[PDB]
Design a protein around this nucleic acid. Structure first.
Lengths: 127, 184, 35, 66
RNA sequence: GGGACCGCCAGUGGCGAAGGCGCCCGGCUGGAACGGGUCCGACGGUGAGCGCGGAAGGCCAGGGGAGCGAACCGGAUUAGAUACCCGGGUAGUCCUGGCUGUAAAGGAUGCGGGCUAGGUGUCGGGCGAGCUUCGAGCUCGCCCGGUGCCGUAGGGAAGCCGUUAAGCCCGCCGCCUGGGGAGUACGGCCGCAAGGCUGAAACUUAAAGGAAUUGGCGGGGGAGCACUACAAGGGGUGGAGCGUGCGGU
């Protein structure tokens, strides 16, 4: 019987994190972030950092009996950004070409019906 | 290497779903498998691709060695499906109810209706009262498992649409989410 | 504090808000000088 | 030097912040993704049929948003 | 377990005197439009003084405090940073009782009536036709009320307005008489205080100010160019001694 995993993908604009878990989602089978692979902080949310860490986690999973995967793309949500970071689809191709059988790929962004007040004050961040 | 202490355990569906094989889960101890949620699409169980968007969270509650049997916790539709169903110039109508079943189960059932156009909120209130009456009637009539199957199959949605057509034609009626509040 | 919106126009002027704040500060000081 | 040869089949257009780059479409001839069509950046002039050598089949170029 | 909050639908949408008001259900209650050959009989418009209401913020007494966040404490930037940026964070934001009574409280348009081309969208109601899966469920047309746009005549300094008038009449109130001094000084009243309302003069000044055209400019946008711009590629200066000119001695 083939094995299927859950690939949480939290892609922020400052970093990207890929977290592989069992079908229950309660067991941490592989977990690699951008800081693992790059040396510059500005390089963390780069597509290269996402995809190579994704491939490393994918080979770890392949070593550990997982063949298929479902992807849970997560955004910051809440009062923060809703758009997944740039590394989302790049990492998706990374697992697809890493030899895993890609299953359902779904957004899991926590979207409030109406949540707390965001950061930035009333005028926002006046950068 | 902690991973080498882990051992696999077969999971299984609810009996009213035939207890089909949904998958395996690795764990160090049988106890930790208790009270574990697994989300599974309906295409996995019934084999129907037309009902892929439907999803069932089953709580793992029983462990016999390597074989894990699960309880039904909740039902939810796909967010992409719901979002596609929602559109501008069409009225979303939510009906959220607490229900006590014939066999004593407590169920929080929330359902959607989307019409052809923008409609007066009095008609929305009337339609709310309508499927509230229908769902209460079926909850009284049906036990837990049978009501679960009818809710998933959409027969409740079909009846709701057919009745509410007297108030306004409905683009679609659906049962968005169901939660198992308490068992008897 | 009967206001004149003409003063809001910053052309050849400060921002009226801070002028009002300054006059309030001076008035507080003066009234305290009288006791 | 495990490089993947590939053959250009279409030229998307002159790209780059100075126009010295060109965005082209290239079909992989040798490698794990043989036959797959991929958009690539090219430095220097290019004609149809130039066998390019790729160091990474995965890499793709962002579309030229006019 | 906690306190805040109720997206998408959501609308040029509805309601409310205004401030303002968006989860469902149950109750109470205000107002409006529609249909009305149903009742009363001019009972009306405006409103000094008066009274009520009144966003945010602040104040008094209690409770609560998730997030945010004046003040403040650190980090960074910068010539310097009491900032913009980042990490923490008091009051406050929330419930109760009360006070303060202010705003670009703007439709920058006080309110009631009569009249002056139309077209067009939507909302609520009513009426007539046609369709209908027979549900005013759907299509179209007419009337009324509110709510948008195009706009004739006309108006205005123009912007723009234009049956929802900034057009022509009728009527009541309030406010203004160059700029600043100044919404200050003094005085009075309210207020726990903050402050609120009322409100000068001396002196100074020949403009301030509103609309729009042409230019120029924009660390605004758009297209085309440029080997006195760059890109790709070569050469070569700035070092050395000398020729020559320049500033200075």
């Amino acid at each position: 019987k083939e094995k299927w995993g859950i690939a949480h993908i939290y892609s922020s604009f400052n970093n990207t994190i890929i977290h592989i878990t069992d079908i229950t989602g309660a067991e941490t089978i592989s977990r690699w972030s951008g800081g693992m692979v790059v040396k510059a902080d500005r390089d963390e949310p780069s597509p290269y950092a996402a995809m190579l860490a994704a491939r490393r986690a994918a080979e770890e999973a392949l070593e550990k009996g997982i063949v298929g995967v479902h992807i849970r793309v997560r955004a910051p949500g809440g009062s923060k950004s809703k758009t997944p970071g740039p590394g989302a689809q790049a990492a998706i191709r990374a697992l697809a070409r890493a030899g895993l059988k890609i299953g359902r790929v779904e957004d899991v962004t926590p979207i409030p019906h109406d949540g707390t007040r965001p950061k930035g004050g009333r005028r926002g961040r006046r950068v | 290497d902690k991973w080498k202490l882990k051992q696999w355990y077969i999971i299984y569906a609810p009996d009213f779903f035939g207890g089909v094989e949904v998958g395996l889960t690795p764990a160090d101890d049988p106890e930790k498998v208790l009270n574990r949620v697994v989300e599974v699409t309906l295409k996995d169980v019934t084999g129907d691709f037309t009902k892929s968007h439907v999803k069932l969270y089953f709580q793992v509650y029983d462990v016999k060695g390597q074989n894990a049997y699960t309880k039904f916790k909740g039902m939810k539709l796909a967010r992409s499906y719901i979002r596609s169903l929602v559109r501008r110039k069409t009225t979303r109508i939510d009906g959220i109810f607490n229900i006590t079943t014939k066999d004593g189960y407590k169920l929080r059932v929330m359902a959607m209706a989307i019409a052809m156009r923008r409609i007066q909120t009095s008609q929305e209130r009337a339609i709310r009262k309508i499927m509230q009456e229908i769902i209460y009637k079926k909850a009284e009539e049906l036990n837990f498992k049978d009501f679960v199957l009818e809710s998933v199959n959409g027969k409740i949605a079909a009846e709701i649409a057919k009745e509410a057509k007297k108030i306004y034609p409905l683009r679609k009626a659906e049962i968005r989410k169901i939660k198992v509040l308490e068992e008897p | 504090m009967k206001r004149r919106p003409r003063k809001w126009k910053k052309k050849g002027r400060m921002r009226w808000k801070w002028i009002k704040k300054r006059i309030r500060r001076l008035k507080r000081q003066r009234k305290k000088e009288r006791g | 030097d495990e490089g993947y040869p590939a053959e250009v089949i279409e030229i998307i257009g002159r790209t780059g912040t100075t126009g010295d780059v060109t965005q082209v479409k290239v079909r992989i001839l040798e490698g794990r993704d043989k036959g797959r069509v991929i958009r690539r950046n090219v430095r220097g002039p290019v004609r149809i049929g130039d066998i390019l050598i790729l160091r990474e089949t995965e890499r793709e170029a962002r579309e030229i948003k006019s």
